[PDB]
């Protein structure tokens, strides 16, 4: 064996949930923008759209209860390209630098690599080297804990138990979606009833989820609401993620945030033209 070092050759097992019982800390519902935002709220209040970070086992119960109270088919939209799953009910990720373990891979290969990784853990009596986020950030690669394996599960296990559907859109962390994934999101929305509830999530519940919320908003409203107002209103509810802000916590990620913003500007124009009569796909546009 080898202690991890955050390279694609020797990636780290990082536990995202403090425990299997940890609460959801970036849960929000897009429709609440209508109750909070002081600008243009046209077209917001009828969305059936919630989002979060990656839940713990118990977190899925909280999300299901939140959705039930608001309520229709529910689709959980996992935006994560990177391999992830659960070890004894705790959310875990296979982490290389900038959380890009599956960067450049086909979606097929990303799934195969995840399921092979999880199968390897599942076959062990004990898993070693499980880092917390603070330990990973501090590069304390050899200070991870061991866990006696009770269960190793993918997200689908928990989502299906709640009677929800699962659909994966493979977006690299900190980046814009690729054209295939944009087409897949637009089609998913078109191909399900207008009343469908989507619970959207990524790893941290920040950039990817907010990007997708903005895309949903543009697809419905870009012909009547300005780009500026869409982005600002999506920033008005917790966690207050403003897609305009491209200088964030990690300076080395600025290029990707900038490219994501340019994507959003182009998607806005596509969405507006689609509401004005353009019948083709994003890739064709």
Known binding-site positions for 1D-myo-inositol hexakisphosphate: 26, 174, 203-204, 206-208, 241, 248, 257, 260
Strands 165-171 and 74-80: parallel
How far apart CA 49 and CA 235 sit, in angstroms, is 15
158 close to 60: Cβ distance less than 8 angstroms: yes
Q: Residue 211: in which H helix or E strand, if any?
A: helix 207-221
Report the SS3 class of residue 162.
coil
**Crossing angle of helices 207-221 and 254-276, rounded to 10°:** 20
Q: Could you tell me the two tokens for 91?
A: 């959310």
- Nearer to Cl ion by C-beta: 41 or 178? 41
- Nearer to Cl ion by C-beta: 5 or 229? 229
The least CB distance from residue 162 to Cl ion, in Å, is 18
- Nearer to Cl ion by C-beta: 79 or 121? 121
Residues 150-179 touching Cl ion, rule: CB under 5 A, are 151-152
| Choices 78-86, 149-157, 180-188, 197-205 (CB under 5 A): range interacting with Cl ion | 149-157
* Residues of each annotated binding site: 26, 174, 203-204, 206-208, 241, 248, 257, 260
246 close to 261: Cβ distance less than 8 angstroms: yes
How many degrees, rounded to 5, is the angle at CA 204 between CA 198 and CA 210?
Answer: 50
107 belongs to the binding site for Cl ion (CB under 5 A): no
How far apart CA 188 and CA 99 sit, in angstroms, is 26
Among 20, 22, 32, 40, binds Cl ion (CB under 5 A): 40
The least CB distance from residue 125 to Cl ion, in Å, is 12
- Nearer to Cl ion by C-beta: 156 or 229? 229
The least CB distance from residue 33 to Cl ion, in Å, is 14
**Residues 6 or more apart whose Cβ sits within 8 Å of residue 47:** 29, 30, 31, 216, 217, 220
Nearest Cα to Cα of residue 211 among 184, 240, 176: 176
The least CB distance from residue 232 to Cl ion, in Å, is 10
- Nearer to Cl ion by C-beta: 37 or 167? 37
| Choices 35-43, 99-107, 110-118, 167-175 (CB under 5 A): range interacting with Cl ion | 35-43
Instruction: Please count the residues of this chain forming the interface with Cl ion, following the rule CB under 5 A.
Output: 6
Residue sitting closest to Cl ion (CB): 226
Residues 209-238 touching Cl ion, rule: CB under 5 A, are 225-226, 229
What proportions of the chain, in percent to the nearest 5, are helix, strand and coil? Answer: 40, 20, 40
CB atoms within 10 A of CB 263: 19
- Nearer to Cl ion by C-beta: 40 or 281? 40
Q: Please give the residue ranges that form the binding site for Cl ion (CB under 5 A).
A: 40, 151-152, 225-226, 229
């Amino acid at each position: 064996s080898i202690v991890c070092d955050s390279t694609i050759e020797n990636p780290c097992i990082v536990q995202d949930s403090k425990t299997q019982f940890s609460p959801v800390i970036r849960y929000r519902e897009v429709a609440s923008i209508a109750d909070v935002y002081g600008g243009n709220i046209t077209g917001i209040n009828k969305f059936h759209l919630s989002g979060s970070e990656q839940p713990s086992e118990k977190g899925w119960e909280a999300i299901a209860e939140s959705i039930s109270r608001k309520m229709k088919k529910v689709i959980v939209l996992d935006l994560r390209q990177e391999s992830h799953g659960y070890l004894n009910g705790r959310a875990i990720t296979l982490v290389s630098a900038y959380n890009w373990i599956n960067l450049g891979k086909s979606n097929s290969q990303s799934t195969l690599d995840q399921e092979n990784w999880l199968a390897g853990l599942r076959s062990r009596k004990i898993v070693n080297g499980v880092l917390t986020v603070p330990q990973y950030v501090a590069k304390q690669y050899s200070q991870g804990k061991s866990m006696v394996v009770s269960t190793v599960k993918n997200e689908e296990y928990y989502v299906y138990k709640k009677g929800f559907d699962y659909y994966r859109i493979f977006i690299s962390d900190h980046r814009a979606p690729l054209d295939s994934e944009v087409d897949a999101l637009v089609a998913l929305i078109k191909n399900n009833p207008e009343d469908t509830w989507y619970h959207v999530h990524c790893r941290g519940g920040k950039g990817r989820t907010t990007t997708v919320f903005a895309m949903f908003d543009m697809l419905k409203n870009a012909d009547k609401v300005s780009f500026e107002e869409i982005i600002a209103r999506q920033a008005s509810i917790p966690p207050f993620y403003n897609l305009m802000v491209t200088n964030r916590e990690i300076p080395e990620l600025t290029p990707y945030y900038e490219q994501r913003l340019q994507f959003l500007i182009h998607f806005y124009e596509f969405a507006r033209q689609s509401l004005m009569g353009y019948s083709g796909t994003w890739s064709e546009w």
